[PDB]
Amino acid sequence: MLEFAPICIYLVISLLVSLILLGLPFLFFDIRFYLVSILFIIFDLEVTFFFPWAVSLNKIDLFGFWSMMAFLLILTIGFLYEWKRGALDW
Amino acid sequence: MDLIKYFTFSMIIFILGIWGILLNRRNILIMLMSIELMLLAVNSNFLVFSVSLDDMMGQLFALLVLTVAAAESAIGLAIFVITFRVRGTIAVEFINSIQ
Amino acid sequence: NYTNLAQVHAAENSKSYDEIEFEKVLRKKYARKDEEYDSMLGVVREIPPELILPDNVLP
């Protein structure tokens, strides 16, 4: 790693500047949201699986490409289910 | 020492999820949260074991456990929503109709 | 009341084969209803006027 220490120090400095900005004046139900969240979970998992596939397309062959395509087809049928059921509508 | 510390932390998180289930009698969402903490401890154990053993099976199965935990959380919150809508409350004494 | 009941009975009894079959199909399909799936779909499944008995003969 060795590169996330600047990120941590940046976070600390951001906290400091935000606190300073706050302290400057002191010196003077619905199921649609649930369905959207579930779709978010599913497609976050989708993108999480895409990332390594996209990075390693050069090593994985047509076997890997077609495995990913089959994964999408299995999950795109679920998207068609969403579309036809009415989960995407509001 | 690093492996000892990581394993101790994961075991402590597992025990802490157990304690959450134990203490939260009238709370059910926190019981599900303790289950999710158990899942997180399992994932951390798999990842640290993969790192220590120089084997990639731990990473594969940790990713799969993450996917399964996300799906089961989706299903579980669906059950929670439908239950709360059916009985109007999340109290445990309203979920004791079967005995 | 029995005059009204006679009117209802005559209306039901003066039906040909096609009307009998159509009302039998409607009665069989509307005999029992599910509200969970109807709510999920967005439908009501209202009772047809063919099976609505006149209010003159209802308590």
Added chain:
Amino acid sequence: MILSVLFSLALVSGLMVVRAKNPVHSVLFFILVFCDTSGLLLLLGLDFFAMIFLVVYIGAIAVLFLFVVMMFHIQIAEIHEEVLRYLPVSGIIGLILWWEMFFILDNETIPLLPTTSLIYTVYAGKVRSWTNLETLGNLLYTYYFVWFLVPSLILLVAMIGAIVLTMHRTTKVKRQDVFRRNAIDFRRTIMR
């Protein structure tokens, strides 16, 4: 030292999850303990796994829990119980599990007592350093495709269950239609 601070924060956040009065505070401390676990993953060297923990656990599952908890609007005395009574049983069970951890550590994983100068660097695998993301993708998509396609079925089952459980289309509500004639062609008309 940084490792000790990180899992001390994680333990405190988990304890706050366990003993938090407000479920919203429980979700927030759950987010905090996930962040601490991500930091532990950075220390381990699994950058991809830390980032995906953030994305999925912190993002997806945690916004799901937050949405459901806030939308419930759970009141106190509806979920409320004294914790002193369960303290003995919690302590006994935790002590048993800790003793089992003790026995597991006492035999298999022996800590090392004080090293750096004795590190033998191969230099052979460093000519092309494979990242964790790269190695995981290569393996998961070439030689373990079945264990990758099966979770697709799990996600499909989850989506189907979520719909069949929490779907309620409006029985009688007008829905706007944009495909009308005045929107499509709109021939002009007059009074004459």
Added chain:
Amino acid sequence: MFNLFLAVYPEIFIINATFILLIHGVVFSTSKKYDYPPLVSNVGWLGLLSVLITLLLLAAGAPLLTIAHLFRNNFFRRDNFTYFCQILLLLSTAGTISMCFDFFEQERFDAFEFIVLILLSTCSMLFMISAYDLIAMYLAIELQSLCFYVMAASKRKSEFSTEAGLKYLILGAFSSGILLFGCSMIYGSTGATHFDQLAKILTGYELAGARSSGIFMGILFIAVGSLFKITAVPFHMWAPDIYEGSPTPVTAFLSIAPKISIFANILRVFIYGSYGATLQQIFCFCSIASMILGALAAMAQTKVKRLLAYSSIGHVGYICIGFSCGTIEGIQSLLIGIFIYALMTIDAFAIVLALRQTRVKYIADLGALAKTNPILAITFSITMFSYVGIPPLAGFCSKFYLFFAALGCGAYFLASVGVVTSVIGCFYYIRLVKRMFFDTPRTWILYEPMDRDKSLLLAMTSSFITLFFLYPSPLFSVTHQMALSLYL
């Protein structure tokens, strides 16, 4: 279709058929052109057809399932044991689908997603039976677990269904966490996930010692998860409540199908991989508890579904005595008991669904059934006596062969506890038979006739149960061959 996938034609066909059925059902149930038809019956008939077709594929392609041995070795291994287990699982799934058709039309349960989940869960159990690794095991277990969560909570507005779904949810998630911790401990202390590697590492060294304490804990936690999956008394508390709360087809499927798959998985992970006397001791204690408390609790029950759940718990305890002996005869007895119990459970739940037309809830509801429905009364009494273990019926065959395996086992304590429990737990079956035949209640609950789909299945199952004592050689030989082929 490249020639490796000869090893997965049944699963591929069932998956593609499930996808086609889902698409067809959604597109023709969300259709305003028709009257939004209830597609549950059509989708169920097509799913039963798909189950029959994949059963034919798996049966005819007996040697072709072994194609690409090393290619599939990472995920699963197929042999005669898995072949017969999958054949029985497909038969049970087909029977469950066929016998739950009349429930749909009469009870208005018109969600074809139920049939879609039936097919998906059946594929999950197929993957589980074939599974030969610590990863495919968990994936298949979780797939059926999510399917069963949705199944138990299927009736949205039903308070019983929602409560059962929530309970089964929470307890299954807890068991999944425990099993995951066990898998993690085994992986950390062993370096291996494939069953062959675990066997190679573990054979020759006992699991009770200073060495391999982490291995012992991982194995114990995996055993705990599997025991929860089979409803052993230390972990049985979900079985009665969810079995009662969930809709009757759902609880019938839960009682019939997962048992064989989980037990085949247990045989392939424990008897082959981690074979050691401590696991048999754990399952001995679990079997003692299962039999004793199943009998004791079913004696006090007054509801048909709860009594069936506790009978299932007791018969799982008997399957556990068969496991805890863990020999050739022990495994053969386990398989015989699983087959007989599956047949008897199919019989009992077919009769229950037949009586579901008039909404039977209590044991007293079926009172005076010997007058209104005589042949049904004799059939259900025969089923109850088979559950008891009366000789002429099929249940006694599994019973005495389990006890014989226990006598050659050396487990005299286990056999004595089992037989005392068998005597103790006869009382509630006898009470059922009394309610049908002996009582003369003031008022009678008249039961509507059956459907042909349940009637044919019930007739075949009752004929098999009653006339099994005339010819048990095929089942005995098949189970012996399976037990022998578990290793070589």
Added chain:
Amino acid sequence: VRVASYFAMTLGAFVFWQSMDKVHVWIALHQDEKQERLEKEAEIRRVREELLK
């Protein structure tokens, strides 16, 4: 105020983790003695077995 309590609990957890490090060091130190105890016990069992035989 809960921020001060949170930081106090963080310090307490830090102290607990240093105690865990101390007990880990103690176990690392006192392992050989357990090894000779186990060896002596195994020798006792072996002698008992050879006397039975």
Added chain:
Amino acid sequence: MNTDITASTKPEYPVVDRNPPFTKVVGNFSTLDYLRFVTITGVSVTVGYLSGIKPGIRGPSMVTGGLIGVMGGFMYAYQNSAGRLMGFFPNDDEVARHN
């Protein structure tokens, strides 16, 4: 990606080829395999028609049954042809043709 076609159980009949191509296996379809395909497709179409009467979608039900039956029957015919061509089945006729 490396693929191995070796099966755990040895074929009991002479092997025309261990890994025949898809086109060759399809072209090996005898009249019996065509009968298998036709019977399975017809059973599926009949079941679909008989089950789709109550919902009211006879054409759609026959179409869905036809796709399912075509898939299943083609899979069964391909399975039989491949098992014969790899020597797993009594492939007397194509063994004679090869000889």
Added chain:
Amino acid sequence: IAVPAEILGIILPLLLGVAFLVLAERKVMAFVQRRKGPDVVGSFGLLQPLADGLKLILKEPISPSSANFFLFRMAPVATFMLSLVAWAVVPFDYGMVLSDSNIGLLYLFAISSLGVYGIITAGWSSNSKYAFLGALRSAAQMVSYEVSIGLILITVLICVGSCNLSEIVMAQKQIWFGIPLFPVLVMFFISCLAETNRAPFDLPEAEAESVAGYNVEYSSMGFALFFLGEYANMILMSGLCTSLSLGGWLPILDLPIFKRIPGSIWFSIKVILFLFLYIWVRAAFPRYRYDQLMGLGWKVFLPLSLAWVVAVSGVSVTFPWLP
């Protein structure tokens, strides 16, 4: 050491750029609308951001006393942290990075994922239920369009083998990826417009309309911090757009007259064009209803993003065109 100096030199000019960005938005919108923006506070209104900030500082604060004081105060802090730490990775030229993470794309995606929590907690901690509902709506919209944004990131990651922005640009050296993927760039631009609640898809800023927003209860500095976070996110995603589909610090045609420009000037110019496009789209178009924008995000951009992922993967795998 030098790391805090670099962090301060990234943070403070970012705040100055955000102030001059809101000033530039005013000026560009006014010039669009046949008027002149702030011109009376300093020459051409250059001191207008300074005057506004000083007024906000000098305004006396008010305490809502919402029984959630900590969560009420810390939500704008959280979003400000998220915007800054997202800006901690974006490159400006060859070697102008703080953390040259090999997983820079997924880091930015994760930071964007964390961004909803500030708004969600702000809506919940407020006493009013209207603010809570508006926060939920904004969170859901950001969720959907971040799914779309992640799919676009996956398309770019298919195009370029690496996952760090610097090597992404080094691959952009040839064709800028905008020539091959102009529709993908357009979809990413609309998705980031809906991600920051800017231009069309502007729910929180429709305060005069019935949707209200999550910033109604917030005091002077809470509102200021939320505004700063939103505008810093706007600049961040403009930088993401130019690093992903315009080559970042790369000139046009690689002519030697164009190489005299340092390259950081090139990145700044491209970011300025993207910000001008932001203000252009905001001024030129009406806004969508919440249901309309949600259906558009879940039904128009997600399928198109998946299709473009598949198409790019198929083009690259079929031909030897693979890195």
Added chain:
Amino acid sequence: ERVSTDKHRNYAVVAGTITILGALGWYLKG
């Protein structure tokens, strides 16, 4: 006047006759 006007039923009858013929041929050739 002497023709069945249901296309779907006619296709179903054709499929059933085809099924019967195929099953008979399978039995004879097996």
Added chain:
Amino acid sequence: MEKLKMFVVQEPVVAASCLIAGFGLFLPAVVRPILDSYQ
């Protein structure tokens, strides 16, 4: 054909996405084997 044209008019975005996905699957299914044979 008429129904296809009506569907494309009514839902252009899904038709465009389907065409793009079909092209993306068609390139490696046919053109990739064609190029492999040509090489």
